[PDB]
Amino acid sequence: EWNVEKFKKDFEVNISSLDAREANFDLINIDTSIANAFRRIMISEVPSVAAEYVYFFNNTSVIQDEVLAHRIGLVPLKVDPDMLTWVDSNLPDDEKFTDENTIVLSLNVKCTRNPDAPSTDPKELYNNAHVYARDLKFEPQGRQSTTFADCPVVPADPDILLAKLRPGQEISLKAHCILGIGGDHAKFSPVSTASYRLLPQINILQPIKGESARRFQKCFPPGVIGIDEGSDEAYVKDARKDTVSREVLRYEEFADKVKLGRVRNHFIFNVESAGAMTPEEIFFKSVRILKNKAEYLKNCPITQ
Amino acid sequence: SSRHGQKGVCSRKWPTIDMPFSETGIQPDIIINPHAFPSRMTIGMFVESLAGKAGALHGIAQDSTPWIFNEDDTPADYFGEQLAKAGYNYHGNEPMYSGATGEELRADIYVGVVYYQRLRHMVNDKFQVRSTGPVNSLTMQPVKGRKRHGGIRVGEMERDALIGHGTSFLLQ
Amino acid sequence: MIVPVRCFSCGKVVGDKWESYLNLLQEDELDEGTALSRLGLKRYCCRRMILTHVDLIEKFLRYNPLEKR
Amino acid sequence: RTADFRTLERESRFINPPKDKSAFPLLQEAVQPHIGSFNALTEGPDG
């Protein structure tokens, strides 16, 4: 008889590490159809801010206009979501972008010859020869000066090489950056790779003491199998360390003496970030979207 | 197409999440059906798949000139040791999970890195649809031309199929 | 052409690591193996995108119709 | 090692085309049937 109080008494979270960009943490005794949904939402449903409409005024560089407009869209912006609101799709263009939906970036780079001694590197030889992502200048439009003053819009990786120039050439553009979900286009995906793995289980069956236990060390990563003697022969130290390479199942000394399965309700999530949000906080967004995906289906009528 | 004559059309731009992710977290860019291999015998592609994954890990380029290897020096044992030295499976296989159900897949999936190509003949100039269209001046029949967007031809042989079914009003 | 902004497969930001990688092979005289791991490219889907890049833009930039010669 | 992509030799050649002699001399030996045939119209013995 399954109950939600039975789930609360046997659900643990063991966080391994938590960096500013990546978080690693285990979920124990939850179903694979629920933990899949958390990976599912962190990639797709969790919203983010990406450039969507790009307005060129003059692009005379080598890179095409539709390519350079695509490269700006893949630039991750360090804008917190839940500051912008969702733009409307079925309202016209003069009313569509506001100071509440949209962040406006711009870029105005001209390349000029530089008189330098001499082959020669183009950072010495041309002025503004490499366009970087930090040259996207945030233009605070509307009332976005009293509310984005603490947090100005900067690219999360400011050294993304956007374009290259030679003198005479220029790029002059103005990109509108709007909120969206990663299931529409992959540029709104808040996470580099949100994924889990299932905890490996190494079941030694016969005692494999002796010199054979030294060559059973080598069939796993080094922080997996430990040896002491014939006593304390071969015990699994940390099965979380093991990648499932099945190198032990191609030896004839150990085809019978081990079994390689998984612990079927022990997940090991690995969540990176695109920089806009911390990875422990795009996990809370994921678990609340699934709840809000279900309240909206509960509190909802049925006609015919 | 790969470099082994294994061409194929894109059947579906398949979404990201329901696509089998790996223990590493990698999702493949191209899924190719394993049934295209027995009839074609392209085993140069099975060895390219685990030579481009060993070469992506260790940061090296592998020579693939013909007749470098020999029947005592099989490249599945050459490149296979390079994957075992990096802590991957010896046979190129990787444990993948399901994108839909989240459960682990039955057997380990053969994943690697293959150099793909894209062919210049594309299907953008193929379809047409006709509802009333321009007609011809002598016979008052629909006009030939994808530019005028009309004139699908029920020719000599397609008439014989409509007689052979016995349907008199599909021929009419 | 220029370095792709993101990894194709996983999606980690790669386009800020091309000018760093050419210093790790010229200045520090490293191999391709340690130069990728120092930049933090640890999944082979995103190691193969810095490792394999051609950088054809420096060959296209030599044809400038907007300056003499 | 077995092979190598020449990833600092390519980049130093894209920026700096060779001023003395073409690299990749097997690519000019691919059309020496065609160019040398046309060269024999106006060069060689007997003009």
Binding site: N24, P221, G223, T243, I268 | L57, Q82 | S37 | -
Partner: peptide, 24 residues
């Protein structure tokens, strides 16, 4: 015929998630 020469100096470069360089 000499066999195809093995590259000398290959190390482990696939660790499971959260473990980076902790094997000595």
């Amino acid at each position: 015929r000499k066999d195809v020469p093995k590259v000398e100096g290959l190390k482990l470069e696939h660790f499971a998630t959260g473990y980076d360089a902790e094997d000595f």
